[PDB]
RNA sequence: AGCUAUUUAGGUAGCGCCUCGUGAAUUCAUCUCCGGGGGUAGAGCACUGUUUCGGCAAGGGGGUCAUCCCGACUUACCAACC
RNA sequence: GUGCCUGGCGGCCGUAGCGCGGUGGUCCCACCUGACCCCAUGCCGAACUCAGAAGUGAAACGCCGUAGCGCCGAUGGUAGUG
RNA sequence: UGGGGCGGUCUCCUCCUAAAGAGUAACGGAGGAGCACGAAGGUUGGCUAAUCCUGGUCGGACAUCAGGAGGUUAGUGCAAUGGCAUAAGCCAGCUUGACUGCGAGCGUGACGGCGCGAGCAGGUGCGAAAGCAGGUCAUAGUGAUCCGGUGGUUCUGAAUGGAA
């Protein structure tokens, strides 16, 4: 990972002066990130999930876990115990490697993107972002894909403040506004 | 890393017309060039 | 409609605390686990507390959640 | 949390032993160090507590935290178990997964002479 | 003049209750002291139900209207949840 | 003679618990680096585990204060009652 | 049956009735059962919710992600009561104890009968082992005797050897 060492050098010295952190352990470290793919159309089509599952595995570097139906909502025609959701978590070494896959060539691939809606935080330093497409990622072949499957990314860090969490996003050249 | 469920990686150099060609552990097929990237947008 | 009721199961404490009992004597017939088994006291499949040894019964309260415990002091 | 979940994971078998009146053998395992001690059936007093923090053994060790060190302490406690007069002891998991050093420590007690 | 069962319900059988005989342990009963689990009376409103008026007030309806898809104001009107 | 430290196992289960603020790192502890392989994730070294360990006391955890709550609580009166 | 014809009820389980042991009536008040599972059983190991609060591809109060509060208000094959995280709730691995012969001593019944059960012998299984397992969180899911059928067993078999 090229930006993992990039994190280990210039991000911490940047954080020590911006919030006067008197400890290197007091810095927010970027933890796991999840690529959510809650298809929702899995009410009768078993084949539809297998695509967005293998595709989500193609986007990442591992097979995602199928999220079963937790509650019983008659409005979405689901009960307890129905395979509908799909998620994969990037944590550790491959967490950094996938971050490179996005912030370098994939993030500017979003149409008319020169700044991001920065106020989409959680309140406890973790950033969330959903994309309507899949094409933006280099792994998509464009011509073999039969439907636009948008995935959702969660940036779980150990940051407690949103701007301190956004400060971590600032050290990674994030187009904000 | 649990075996058999992982797709394979490759050392893909994210090529750019400006010169932002950097290797990324990816899984597409080859190394492609494009303008709009991290430092060519 | 109604007008039907089951016949009582005759539960409760068969042998009260302070009684010298023989091994195998039934102490408490309950539905749930109102009283948990202590020392020298086994809990049946019907949650019926019986005597594993002889001795006097000692109703006590133990554990961090304050639940009743029945133990037998073989004296 | 790690510690809190471990205690709620070990309390199941520990209550079964206090009703069984067996002399237990608890094991505390940390990244840096591994402990092993014997506790009398009453529950308060301990008998033999041989651990890696005892420098009388550390001067013969390489680095407390590896398998061989676990085999070293298991030998020490099992020998001293007989040196104090403890014959049959029931091994206790203490929430730890019976795979690594704990398995190495349990083997060390068995090959030394302790019964279980 | 009870319990259980009965093509049983003013009948009958077993146990309880009575009498005679025989045989047995301070055995049984009263008060005091000690050891007990109870959850009723009372009390209370965390939980479980439910009350009232008040608030929020969704479906909004209809009009000053949009006189196209929206809906603003809205007379104020019950007032799902809390 | 002991004292302050942490960790382990109990007695006792809120006077023992939350909350706020203040401290604590040689040791202990947690966190951390790596993971071809022991082992594991119905996805991922998060957890599980091994090999180790620079760094830190932020988080966690320990301790010291604070009684804002929690919890505890007579005497007396009252409700109720044999 | 407060007289009878029209409707209900009769066996079993839960709550109240029910006056703090147990029991306890009404054509008194609320509900359910006449099965189910080869696993929803046993064991080993692991895990633990509901409900909302925030920013989020479609996606909205109402799928799915993460954080947080919260705390068992969730769940437990089924009705309600009691119970449960040491989980009995959820997931997985391995398996068949849903085992044969007995049973100290007990609770419940007039009785028939029903229920609990340490420990003992043979043998089986799970776990490293300690130990645990003779059905399932428990309380319903079921009925006497006679007559007769199927299989096994020299125990008998009316003169003896067989057979019925």
Curated annotation (Swiss-Prot), chain A:
Keyword Repeat: no
Record PROSITE patterns: RIBOSOMAL_L5
Function comment: This is one of the proteins that bind and probably mediate the attachment of the 5S RNA into the large ribosomal subunit, where it forms part of the central protuberance. Its 5S rRNA binding is significantly enhanced in the presence of L18. In the 70S ribosome in the initiation state was modeled to contact protein S13 of the 30S subunit (bridge B1b), connecting the 2 subunits; the protein-protein contacts between S13 and L5 in B1b change in the model with bound EF-G implicating this bridge in subunit movement. In the two 3.5 A resolved ribosome structures the contacts between L5, S13 and S19 are different, confirming the dynamic nature of this interaction.
Keyword Ribonucleoprotein: yes
Protein encoded by which gene: rplE
Name assigned to this protein: Large ribosomal subunit protein uL5
Subunit structure comment from the entry: Part of the 50S ribosomal subunit; part of the 5S rRNA/L5/L18/L25 subcomplex. Contacts the 5S rRNA; cross-links to the P site tRNA. Forms a bridge to the 30S subunit in the 70S ribosome, contacting protein S13 and S19.
GO-annotated cellular components: cytoplasm; cytosol; cytosolic large ribosomal subunit
Molecular-function annotations in GO: 5S rRNA binding; RNA binding; structural constituent of ribosome; tRNA binding
UniProt family annotation: Belongs to the universal ribosomal protein uL5 family.
One protein family per Pfam: Ribosomal_L5
Other facts noted in the record for this chain: Identified as a multicopy suppressor of the slow growth phenotype of an rsgA (yjeQ) deletion mutant.
GO biological process, one term: translation
Modified residues (N6-acetyllysine): 2
From Swiss-Prot, chain B:
Co-factor: note: Binds 1 zinc ion per subunit. Only 1 ligand appears to be Cys, the other are thought to be His and either backbone amides or solvent.
Top-rank taxon: Bacteria
UniProtKB keywords: Acetylation, Metal-binding, Ribonucleoprotein, Ribosomal protein, RNA-binding, rRNA-binding, Zinc
Residue numbers of N6-acetyllysine PTMs: 8
Residue positions binding Zn(2+): 16
GO CC list: cytoplasm; cytosol; cytosolic large ribosomal subunit
Entry keyword annotation includes Ribosomal protein: yes
Residue ranges of coiled coil: none
BP-aspect Gene Ontology terms: cytoplasmic translation; negative regulation of cytoplasmic translational initiation; translation; translational initiation
Cofactor: Zn(2+)
Subunit comment: Part of the 50S ribosomal subunit.
Family: Belongs to the bacterial ribosomal protein bL31 family. Type A subfamily.
Official protein name in the record: Large ribosomal subunit protein bL31
Gene source species: Escherichia coli (strain K12)
Included range, full protein: 1 to 41 of 70
From Swiss-Prot, chain C:
Name of one Pfam family that matches: Ribosomal_L27
Listed GO CC annotations: cytoplasm; cytosolic large ribosomal subunit
Entries under InterPro entries matching the protein: Ribosomal_bL27, Ribosomal_bL27_CS
Record keyword Transcription present: no
Gene Ontology terms: biological process: assembly of large subunit precursor of preribosome; cytoplasmic translation; cytosolic ribosome assembly; positive regulation of ribosome biogenesis; regulation of cell growth; ribosomal large subunit assembly
Entry keyword set: Ribonucleoprotein, Ribosomal protein, RNA-binding, rRNA-binding, tRNA-binding
PROSITE patterns: RIBOSOMAL_L27 (PS00831)
The organism's place on the tree of life at top rank: Bacteria
Alphabetized GO MF terms: ribosome binding; rRNA binding; structural constituent of ribosome; tRNA binding
Annotated signal peptide: none
NCBIfam families per UniProt: L27
Similarity section: Belongs to the bacterial ribosomal protein bL27 family.
Oligomer status and interactors: Part of the 50S ribosomal subunit. Cross-links to the 23S rRNA. Cross-links to the A and P site tRNAs.
PANTHER family: LARGE RIBOSOMAL SUBUNIT PROTEIN BL27M (PTHR15893:SF0), RIBOSOMAL PROTEIN L27 (PTHR15893)
Protein name (database record): Large ribosomal subunit protein bL27
Organism: Escherichia coli (strain K12)
Upper classification of the organism: Bacteria, Pseudomonadati, Pseudomonadota, Gammaproteobacteria, Enterobacterales
Curated annotation (Swiss-Prot), chain D:
PTM note: The protein has been shown to contain a phosphoserine, which was required for the protein to bind to 5S rRNA. However, the presence of this phosphoserine is controversial, and it has not been seen by mass spectrometry.
UniProt-listed GO biological process terms: cytoplasmic translation
Region (Required for binding of the 5S rRNA/L5/L18 complex to the 23S rRNA): 1-16
Keyword list, A-Z: Phosphoprotein, Ribonucleoprotein, Ribosomal protein, RNA-binding, rRNA-binding
Superkingdom, natural source: Bacteria
GO CC annotation terms, alphabetical: cytoplasm; cytosol; cytosolic large ribosomal subunit
One Pfam family here: Ribosomal_L18p
GO molecular function terms attached to this record: 5S rRNA binding; structural constituent of ribosome
Keyword Transcription: no
Matching NCBIfam families: L18_bact (TIGR00060)
Domain description: The basic N-terminus is not necessary for binding to 5S rRNA. It is however required for cooperative binding of L5 and L18 to 5S rRNA as well as for binding of the 5S rRNA/L5/L18 complex to the 23S rRNA.
Quaternary structure, from the entry: Part of the 50S ribosomal subunit; part of the 5S rRNA/L5/L18/L25 subcomplex. Contacts the 5S and 23S rRNAs.
Similarity section: Belongs to the universal ribosomal protein uL18 family.
Function: This is one of the proteins that mediates the attachment of the 5S rRNA subcomplex onto the large ribosomal subunit where it forms part of the central protuberance. Binds stably to 5S rRNA; increases binding abilities of L5 in a cooperative fashion; both proteins together confer 23S rRNA binding. The 5S rRNA and some of its associated proteins might help stabilize positioning of ribosome-bound tRNAs.
